[PDB]
Amino acid sequence: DSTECSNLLLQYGSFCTQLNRALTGIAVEQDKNTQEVFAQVKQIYKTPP
Amino acid sequence: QIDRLITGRLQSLQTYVTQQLIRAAEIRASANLAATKMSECVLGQSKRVD
16 A cells, blocks of 8 residues: 555566466466366266165 | 666576576476386386376
């Protein structure tokens, strides 16, 4: 919640976008690993009674 | 001003080098996996499931 701070920060470059892309890649690869570990069969089997 | 520019460019270069090192570690892991697959599936019959 600052104005001059953002004006001085926008002169540094693409650090903001780089960090955002890194965090987004981390968040995507987390779900990728979660799917690769558990979701291995595309058919939900049910045990008989 | 020259010192500020040098510091900024050096920080950018160090960030690039760190990102390249991380990507190189990932690619090395993938290449080791690919070499293991080349040695097992191609040069033999791997009984490992999936």
